[PDB]
Each structure stands twice: as C-alpha cells, then as structure tokens.
Amino acid sequence: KEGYLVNKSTGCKYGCLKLGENEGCDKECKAKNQGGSYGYCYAFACWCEGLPESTPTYPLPNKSCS
C-alpha cells in the first residue's frame, strides 16, 4: 500500500519543502522500520509506496495530529 509516513510518537506527518522527487522522503520511506520501496514529497509531506500492511500510514487510529 501507500500513503503518508506518520511519526509513531506524535502522529504527525514528516514534512518536506522540495516537492516531487525527494531523496529525503525516499530515504525515510526506505528505512527498514518503514519498509517502503520508494518515496517522494507530496503536498509538503513524505509519501511512501510499497509499504507493507504492517506499516502504519497517516493517520494513527489513536494518535491525533489534526
């Protein structure tokens, strides 16, 4: 699946300024604790594709940031 990376402690998305291709989001999305295949910045927040079912995406069911 895909979606926004969410910080497990705050429940907030990871921000990014450079839109489109973003090595910053790609790196975070690829981290072994996330397990994604590719990442990029979308609407000023890191989007991750190829995430395993086990990896949560924004929003956290019990940790609000909105």
UniProtKB/Swiss-Prot annotation:
Disulfide bonds join 12-65, 16-41, 25-46, 29-48. Residues 1-66 form the LCN-type CS-alpha/beta domain. Keywords: Disulfide bond, Ion channel impairing toxin, Neurotoxin, Secreted, Signal, Toxin, Voltage-gated sodium channel impairing toxin. Its main location: secreted. GO terms for cellular component: extracellular region. One of its GO terms (biological process) is defense response. Expressed by the venom gland. It is found in: Secreted. The keyword Signal applies. GO terms for molecular function: sodium channel inhibitor activity; toxin activity. Beta toxins bind voltage-independently at site-4 of sodium channels (Nav) and shift the voltage of activation toward more negative potentials thereby affecting sodium channel activation and promoting spontaneous and repetitive firing. Induces immediate paralysis in crickets after injection, with a total paralysis occurring within 15-30 minutes and lasting for 1-2 hours. Is also lethal to vertebrate (chicks) when injected in very high dosages (more that 100 mg/kg). Belongs to the long (4 C-C) scorpion toxin superfamily. Sodium channel inhibitor family. Beta subfamily. Has the structural arrangement of an alpha-helix connected to antiparallel beta-sheets by disulfide bonds (CS-alpha/beta). This is Toxin CsEv2. It comes from Centruroides sculpturatus. The lineage of its organism: Eukaryota, Metazoa, Ecdysozoa, Arthropoda, Chelicerata. The chain holds residues 20 to 85 of 87 of the full protein.
